[PDB]
Amino acid sequence: MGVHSFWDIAGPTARPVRLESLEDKRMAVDASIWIYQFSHITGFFRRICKLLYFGIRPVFVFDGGVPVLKRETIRQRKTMDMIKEVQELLSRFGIPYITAPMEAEAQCAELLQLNLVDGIITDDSDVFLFGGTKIYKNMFHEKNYVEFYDAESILKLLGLDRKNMIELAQLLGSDYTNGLKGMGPVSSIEVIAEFGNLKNFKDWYNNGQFDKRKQETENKFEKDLRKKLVNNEIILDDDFPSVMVYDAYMRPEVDHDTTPFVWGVPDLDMLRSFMKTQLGWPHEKSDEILIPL
DNA sequence: GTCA
């Protein structure tokens, strides 16, 4: 997920962290993203166990609904009784969960900004756009280490602040915008490097679009860029950059609740029962995995 | 370099 291929750009700044080092950390986890995949009880259970195995204290976050901007965009790119059975599993695991007003990602970012969590576990790079600043990526790949990302390293090493990343999304694409046809990680980062921002990029493109001369006296990088935008027949309007896309990312609907989370030990019997009730499990299988933790 |  995320600004399409934004992870490609943020990429060079990742720093590998052993999962052992995460012991005792309060971590926001976007639950809705998991439900949108996972059978739905099995995946949760495995992932939850990996989490607890390493001593992570997770807070699961759920969507309170999908904003209109996100609905349109996903559709174009092409029971909730499952959500209950999973909050059942969580509660029986002692793990707290909240339902956000709108987006789990944006809410997750707010938990970090309020010191209710230490980091965000996510593979959705839109979390940077909503202002998330301490991201753990590839938590459920089969590895012993995870990739750590923070907004400061991105700032110092790449020269990209939060506004820059929202404008990167309007080139690359994301949960809110399709980006521009023909634009990927490298064209997009270079457009920001050359013009600083999208207004100067639109201006450069409209001012030379029919002025016969400037097009022949342009740098090579420009000459190739103009070509690609024209091949794709792109119209840079007064709608570009989008003010509403900027607004959805900069001020999303979020729950300023400042009440610290509480974590309980799991319950070895409520879980063994649970899995039997639903997944046709024995108390042998259940106990063998859990009891260690 | 950008997409199956």
Residue numbers in the entry: 1 to 38, 53 to 92, 768 to 982
Q: Which text from the study accompanies this structure?
A:
Briefly, complex I comprises a Rad2-ΔSC dimer that interacts with disordered DNA. Although it may represent a functional state of the enzyme, we assume it is rather a non-productive complex. For Sc-Rad2-ΔSC in all 10 independent determinations of the structure we report herein (including the non-catalytic dimer), helix α5 is missing. However, α4 has a similar location in all 10 protein structure determinations from four different space groups, implying that the conformation we observed is stable.
Rad2/XPG belongs to the flap endonuclease family that encompasses various structure-specific nucleases involved in nucleic acid processing. The unique feature of Rad2/XPG is the recognition of DNA bubbles that comprise a stretch of unpaired bases flanked by double-stranded regions and correspond to the DNA in the NER pre-incision complex. We report four structures of the Rad2 catalytic core solved in four different space groups, three of which represent the productive substrate binding mode and reveal that the protein recognizes a single 5′ nucleotide of the single-stranded portion of the DNA and a 3′ phosphate group of the ss/dsDNA junction. The two critical regions for substrate binding are the H2TH module with a Rad2-specific α-helix 12b and the hydrophobic wedge that binds the first base pair of the double-stranded portion of the DNA.
